[PDB]
Symmetry: D3
Subunit: 231 residues, 6 copies
C-alpha cells in the first residue's frame, strides 16, 4: 500500500485511531503490552501490541476527512481491520458541555462534500455502530465520567471566515466540533465494518476556555481506557 508499509498480518482487527501519530506512540507505549511499530511512512506512526491477551493496533490518521479516509480505506481493505475506534479531542460548541467532558459521537454532521458527491443532494447520516456506542457509554458510566452521547460536527475548516461559525449547528443540538468522524462512519458503513468515535473536550469554543496540559493527559488516559474496554 502506498501509505502504510507493513506486511499483511501486522495490523490487528481492532484498532484505535488518534489523529496525531505521536498520540498513537503515546497510546502504544502506555497502554499496550509489547507494542511493535509497523509503519513510519509520512511519520504516520502505527503500532500493534496486546491488551488482555488480545491484539490491538493504534494508527495515526492525520487531520481531516481526506487524510483519515486514506488510512481507514487501507486498514479495512488491505489489512482486514473490523473494529475501528477513533479517540480524539473536540471543541465544545454548547455551554451544556464542560471541559474534560467525554463525548461519544452517535452520529457525525459534516461540511465535507464526501456524501454530497455520492448521494447528490440527498442527506446521508453517518452513524456509530450501536453495540460499540452502548458499550463505551456503560464503561464511561461505571467510571463516573461526565459523558454525553450525541451529534458532532466533522468540519473541513478549522479556521473560519467569520465569527460564530458553529451557531446554527449548536441550535440544532450538535455538541462538539472535530474533523474525522463523518469520514470514519461513512467508510465503516460502506465496508460493513464497525466503528466508533470517542472524544475528549479540550477546548470550549463558546467560553474560550482551554484545558491545562496535565488535565488533558488525565482525561485522555480515561478515554483510552474506555476505548480499550469497548473492543
Amino acid at each position: 500500500t502506498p501509505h502504510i508499509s507493513a506486511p499483511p498480518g501486522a495490523v490487528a482487527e481492532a484498532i484505535l485511531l488518534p489523529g496525531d501519530p505521536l498520540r498513537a506512540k503515546y497510546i502504544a507505549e502506555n497502554f499496550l503490552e509489547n507494542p511493535v511499530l509497523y509503519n513510519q511512512v509520512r511519520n504516520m506512526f502505527g503500532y500493534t501490541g496486546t491488551y488482555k491477551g488480545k491484539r490491538v493496533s493504534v494508527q495515526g490518521t492525520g487531520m481531516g476527512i481526506p487524510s483519515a479516509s486514506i488510512y481507514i480505506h487501507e486498514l479495512v481493505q488491505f489489512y482486514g481491520c473490523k473494529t475501528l475506534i477513533r479517540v480524539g479531542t473536540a471543541g465544545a460548541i454548547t455551554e451544556r458541555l464542560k471541559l474534560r467532558d467525554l463525548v461519544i459521537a452517535q452520529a457525525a454532521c459534516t461540511d465535507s462534500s464526501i456524501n454530497n458527491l455520492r448521494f447528490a443532494g440527498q442527506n446521508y447520516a453517518p452513524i456509530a455502530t450501536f453495540d460499540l456506542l452502548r458499550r463505551a457509554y456503560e464503561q464511561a458510566q461505571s467510571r463516573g465520567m461526565p459523558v454525553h452521547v450525541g451529534n458532532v460536527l466533522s468540519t473541513d475548516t478549522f479556521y473560519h471566515d467569520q465569527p460564530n461559525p458553529y451557531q446554527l449547528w449548536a441550535q440544532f443540538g450538535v455538541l462538539a466540533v472535530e474533523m474525522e468522524a463523518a469520514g470514519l462512519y461513512t467508510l465503516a458503513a460502506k465496508f460493513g465494518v464497525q466503528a466508533l468515535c470517542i472524544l475528549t473536550i479540550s477546548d470550549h469554543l463558546i467560553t474560550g476556555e482551554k484545558t491545562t496540559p496535565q488535565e488533558r493527559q488525565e482525561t485522555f488516559d480515561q478515554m483510552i481506557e474506555v476505548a480499550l474496554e469497548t473492543i
Copy 2:
C-alpha cells in the same frame, strides 16, 4: 391552533406518534386507561389516557415530513410535549432484516429538502435522543424481540420513478424506509425536546414479502409495549 383544536392542558408531555389516526385510536383503546379524544380536525385523531398512573397522549401525524412537522410543531410549541415517540411501520431494504423485525432509528437519512434549506448543502444528521434509544433497546431485549438499531431513510417518495430506488442507501447500511423520522428528529433537536422513532417491519422491499394482517397486530402490540415502557 389551526390543526389541533384542544384546550392547552389536554395533551400529555409524553406522546406516541403513529402516522395513521386510526392506529392512534387503536393504541388509546387497547393500551391506555380512560382514553379521552382531544382532537378530530382533519380526522387526525388524538387521545389522552394514562399508563401506570402517568398521562400519555397519542396523536396521528399523517404521512410525510410536511404533515408530521405540522403536528409536531403544534404539540411541542403549543401543547408543551417533551417526549415524542413515533411508532410506525417501515419497509426493510436489506435481507439482513426479516419481516416483524423491530427497528429503532439511531438516525434518519432523508431525501427531503427540510435541512438543505437550512444548512445550505452542509450535512446535518437527525438523531434519536440516546437515553430513549438505549431504553427501548433494553426493553426489546428483555422481551427477546428481534431488534436492530441503526439508520432509516425518511423519504418524500413512496412510489419511485425507476426500480432499485434504495440500492445506494442499503449499500451504506440503511436498514429500512419510512416517511417521518427525519422531520421528528430535526424538530425535536431545534426545540430542545426528546424524541425516538420505533418501527415494525411490515414489508420487505427486497424479498417482496408482506406480513399477514394478524402478524402485524401481534408485533405492533409488542412495539407499543416497548414504546410505553420507554417513556
Copy 3:
C-alpha cells in the same frame, strides 16, 4: 393499494382533491347525487357520486407533497383517474389579493426536493392543464367572483423559523401559499393526465387577517361549483 382500499370501478375518471377528508365528506354530501364512500383507510375519506348525470369522485389527500403524491399516484395508476382538480385554501402573500379571492394556479413554485431530485439542479415548472385553467377562469368570471390566475408556492414548511418567509416569492409575483399543487402538477405531467388547482384565500399572511367560518363556507361552496363546472 396500501392507501385506498376500493375495487377499480368505484372511483370516477374525474376527481376533486381536497386536503381535508372531512371536506371530502362535505363536498360529496352537499354537491353530488348519491354519494357513496369507497375509502376509509387512515381516515382518508373518498366518495363517488354523480354531477349532472356523470360520475365524480372526491378524495382527501392529506397535507404536503409526500402525502398527496401517494393518493395521486394511486388514483392515476390504479384507478384510471384522468381529470384531477385540487380544491383547497391558501394564505395570500400579496396585498393585491384580498380574503375570499379565488386563486387559480397557473403554475406552482416549491421548496420541496421533488424535482431537484429528478432534474438535478435544473428548473422544471409544474403547470396546470391550460384547458381546465381557462374553463375555471370563465366559470369564475360568470359568477362575478374576484379571481386571480398565476403562481402559488407549494411549501413543505407550514411553520417558519424567521419572520417574512414569503417576501422573495411575493417580490416575484407569487400570489399565495399552500402545500400540494407542485406535486399534483408534476405527477399529472409525468402520467399524461389533466390537473388544476383552485384555491380560496382563507388567510392573509401579510395583513394577518382571517375569515369567519361562515365566510369561508360561502366562498368555498362557490369554488366547488366552479370546479364541478370545469370537469
Copy 4:
C-alpha cells in the same frame, strides 16, 4: 443606457422581442406603419412604428438569457415598457407537435442559474401573464392555427455534450426548446410588468425534420399577427 442609445419616449409601452435583430427589421418593415429605427448599438436593431392607432416597438434581444436580460432590463427600467411579447422559433421535443405548430409558453423551464442564484435551490416557476396568454390563444383559435399551450425549456446550451438531451423534459410534458423565455418571464415578474412568449416550430428535434424557408416566412407572418392582436 449603454446597450440601447435612444432618447426616452422613442420606445413604446408595447414591444415585440425577436432574438434576431434582422427579424426585428422584417417585422417593422412589414407590419408597422412609419417604422423608425431607434437603435443601432451592437447591430441590435430596435424600431418604433404604429399598429391600428397605437405605437408598437420591436427590439432584437440576441440569443440566451444573459443577452435578452440586458435588453429586457433596459427596455423596462429605462424606457418604460409594460407589455413585452417574445416572438421566436423553437425545436419541438415531442412527436405531438408537428412542424409549423404555434406554441404559447404558459411557463418556462430552464437549465440557467438565473433563479438558483436567487432562490438558492428552491424552485421558482417563470410564467406568462395569463391575460396575454388567454388573448394569444383566442387569436390563434379564430385563425384556425394549430396551437399548443404548455411548458417550454429555456436552455443555455444550443449544442449538447450528449445525445437525447431533452428526453427527461419531454417525459414531463415540455413541448419545445428555445433560449430566452425564462429570463423574460422572471424579469417581467420582478418588474411588475406583463409578458408572453409565442413560438413557431421550425425544427423537430425528435423526427429530425425541418421547415423550408417558404414555410418559415408563412407561419412566422401568422405569429406576428397574433402577437400584434394580443398586444
Copy 5:
C-alpha cells in the same frame, strides 16, 4: 451551420472574438489586409483578412456564455478554428486596477450553470492556454502597457438585484467582470483547441469612473495589436 453561413475555408484557424459585431467590423477595417465579410446572419459580422502574411478572422460573439458558446462551437467544430482570442472590455472590481489597464484572464470564474450541469457540483477551473497567456503578457510588457494577469468573472447578470454584487469575488482576488471568458475557456478545453481572453478596463465598478470615448478607442487599438501579435 445555422448561425454562420459561410463555405468551409472562409474562416481562418486563428480568430479574434469581440462581443460586438461592429467592433469586429472596426478590427477588420483597421488591422486586416483585404478584409472579406463572410457572415451576415443575425447581424453578427464575421470577417477574414490577412495580418503579416497569415490569414486572421474576426467574429462577433454577442453577449453572454449561451450566445458566445454557439459561435465558438460552430467556429471550432464546423470551420476548423484552433486559436481563439477574445478581445473585450471589463468592469474593474478592485481599486488596484485603474481605467485603461489591460487584463489577461489566466482563468475565469462564473455564476453560469455551464459546468455545474456537467460536473454536478464539483469545481472545474476554466483556464487560458498558457502559451498564449505568456505571449500576450510579453507583448504588453514591451509596449509598456499597464497589465494584470489573474482571475476574471464571467457573469450571466449585467444588472444586479442588489448592490456590491462583486464584493466576495474581489476579496478572493478577482480582477474584473465580463460575460464570455468561462464559456470560451471551457469549450476550448473540451475541443482540444487554444484560447485566450484579453480585456481592457473601460469601467471601474468600485470608483464609479468611466473612460471617455477617445480613451476607449486608444487602449482598444493597443489591445488588438497585442492579440494579433499573440496569435
Copy 6:
C-alpha cells in the same frame, strides 16, 4: 498555534510546502544551508535554513485540503509567510503526460466543498500567482525538463468507488491529480499572498505505470531546484 509551535521569527517569508514531513526533512537537509527544525507537533516537521544567503522554510502540510489549510492559515496569519510553494507528486490522467514530467498548476479544480460553502454554487477558479508560474516555467525550460502548465484536480478522495473516476476531468484538459493545490490557491488569494504548486508525475493513472525510487528522487531534486530558483 495549536499546530506549529515556534516563535514568530523562526519561519521565513518564503516557504516550500511538501505534503510529507519526511520530504520536508529531505529538502532541508539536502538543499538548504544550516537547516534548523522549528516544529515537531504531530510529527509535522518544519525547518528553516538559507538558500543563496536568504532564509527559506520548508513545512510538511499533510494530505488533503483540510490538513493543508490548517498549516497554510497559520503560516500566513501567525508567521507572516508571503511566498508559498507547494512541491509534491501527482498522478497523470492523460496519455500526453509521461512519468517524470513536471507539472506547474496554473489553476486547480476540486471536488472539495471549500468554495461551494463560500460562493454558494457559483464557480471560483483557484489560480497560481502568475509571476511565480512564469518564473518556474522558465527555470524548467532552462534545464531542458519536460514541463506542462495547466489544470490539476485537487481531490478529497484518494480511493475511488468506480473505475475511470478521472475521465471527465481529462476530457476537459485536466493534467494530473493531487490533493492540496485548490486549498493553497484559495487561501493565498483570500490572504493576498503569493503561491504556486509544482508537481512531479510519479504515477500514471491511465497506463497504470509507476516510477522507481531512484527515478522519483532524481526528478524530485530537479523540482526542488526549480522551486528554490522561483522564490
